[PDB]
Design an enzyme around this catalytic site. Sequence first.
Site, PDB file in Angstrom:
ATOM      1  N   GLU A   5      50.977  41.327  41.876  1.00  0.00           N
ATOM      2  CA  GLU A   5      50.193  40.209  42.373  1.00  0.00           C
ATOM      3  C   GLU A   5      50.931  39.391  43.409  1.00  0.00           C
ATOM      4  O   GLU A   5      50.351  39.008  44.412  1.00  0.00           O
ATOM      5  CB  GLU A   5      49.755  39.243  41.253  1.00  0.00           C
ATOM      6  CG  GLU A   5      48.581  39.678  40.378  1.00  0.00           C
ATOM      7  CD  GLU A   5      47.300  40.003  41.136  1.00  0.00           C
ATOM      8  OE1 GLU A   5      47.127  39.571  42.292  1.00  0.00           O
ATOM      9  OE2 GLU A   5      46.437  40.695  40.555  1.00  0.00           O
ATOM     10  N   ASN A  32      40.663  34.286  50.769  1.00  0.00           N
ATOM     11  CA  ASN A  32      39.578  35.251  50.808  1.00  0.00           C
ATOM     12  C   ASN A  32      38.507  34.644  51.709  1.00  0.00           C
ATOM     13  O   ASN A  32      37.730  33.781  51.288  1.00  0.00           O
ATOM     14  CB  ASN A  32      39.036  35.471  49.392  1.00  0.00           C
ATOM     15  CG  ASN A  32      40.127  35.880  48.404  1.00  0.00           C
ATOM     16  OD1 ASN A  32      40.627  37.002  48.451  1.00  0.00           O
ATOM     17  ND2 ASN A  32      40.511  34.966  47.517  1.00  0.00           N
ATOM     18  N   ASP A  41      34.592  34.889  50.729  1.00  0.00           N
ATOM     19  CA  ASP A  41      33.893  33.927  49.874  1.00  0.00           C
ATOM     20  C   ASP A  41      34.598  32.560  49.775  1.00  0.00           C
ATOM     21  O   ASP A  41      34.374  31.802  48.837  1.00  0.00           O
ATOM     22  CB  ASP A  41      33.624  34.541  48.477  1.00  0.00           C
ATOM     23  CG  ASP A  41      34.790  34.379  47.509  1.00  0.00           C
ATOM     24  OD1 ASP A  41      35.957  34.587  47.908  1.00  0.00           O
ATOM     25  OD2 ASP A  41      34.522  34.027  46.338  1.00  0.00           O
ATOM     26  N   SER A  64      37.678  31.408  48.942  1.00  0.00           N
ATOM     27  CA  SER A  64      38.405  31.000  47.757  1.00  0.00           C
ATOM     28  C   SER A  64      39.858  31.368  48.042  1.00  0.00           C
ATOM     29  O   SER A  64      40.142  31.995  49.063  1.00  0.00           O
ATOM     30  CB  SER A  64      37.847  31.681  46.488  1.00  0.00           C
ATOM     31  OG  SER A  64      38.090  33.082  46.450  1.00  0.00           O
ATOM     32  N   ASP A  81      43.751  32.700  46.163  1.00  0.00           N
ATOM     33  CA  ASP A  81      44.495  33.181  45.008  1.00  0.00           C
ATOM     34  C   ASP A  81      45.794  32.385  45.023  1.00  0.00           C
ATOM     35  O   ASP A  81      46.418  32.259  46.064  1.00  0.00           O
ATOM     36  CB  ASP A  81      44.760  34.673  45.138  1.00  0.00           C
ATOM     37  CG  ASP A  81      43.485  35.473  45.247  1.00  0.00           C
ATOM     38  OD1 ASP A  81      42.475  35.072  44.640  1.00  0.00           O
ATOM     39  OD2 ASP A  81      43.475  36.480  45.971  1.00  0.00           O
ATOM     40  N   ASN A 131      42.443  32.815  40.991  1.00  0.00           N
ATOM     41  CA  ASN A 131      41.381  32.396  41.916  1.00  0.00           C
ATOM     42  C   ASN A 131      40.704  31.021  41.738  1.00  0.00           C
ATOM     43  O   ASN A 131      40.195  30.686  40.664  1.00  0.00           O
ATOM     44  CB  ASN A 131      40.304  33.491  41.945  1.00  0.00           C
ATOM     45  CG  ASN A 131      39.336  33.313  43.068  1.00  0.00           C
ATOM     46  OD1 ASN A 131      38.221  32.833  42.871  1.00  0.00           O
ATOM     47  ND2 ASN A 131      39.755  33.685  44.268  1.00  0.00           N
TER      48      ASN A 131
END
Length: 130
Positions: A35, A46, A49, A51, A53, A60
């Site tokens: 990750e 992202n 959409d 958002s 991480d 998220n």
Amino acid sequence: KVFERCETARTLKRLGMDGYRGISLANWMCLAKWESGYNTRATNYNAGDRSTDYGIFQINSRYWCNDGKTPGAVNACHLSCSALLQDNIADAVACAKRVVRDPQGIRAWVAWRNRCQNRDVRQYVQGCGV
């Protein structure tokens, strides 16, 4: 902060992750290695959409933490996404435990499925004393 492999393993073990909801420490390790490479200030936006991480587990903004800018998002961990960028990972671990409290469990993260599920993950904790 960029933890060293074994250093992550003991910090995660100390925080009560070993076997949390049937999920071994090696599994949590494999997830964090892929990750973020064990980097707590890691972030991925992202654009698809809007958002982001956050942290060592790339959690998220749409479901787990509030960053003020994700359209129609929720804060199931009841933490500001800032909490997920600390060198101290207690808050991130608390949020990750919350995530796995849902149906999917650890499957929540597609990276885990991609490179941890049905794989040899012993190598992640080998020699860390956990």
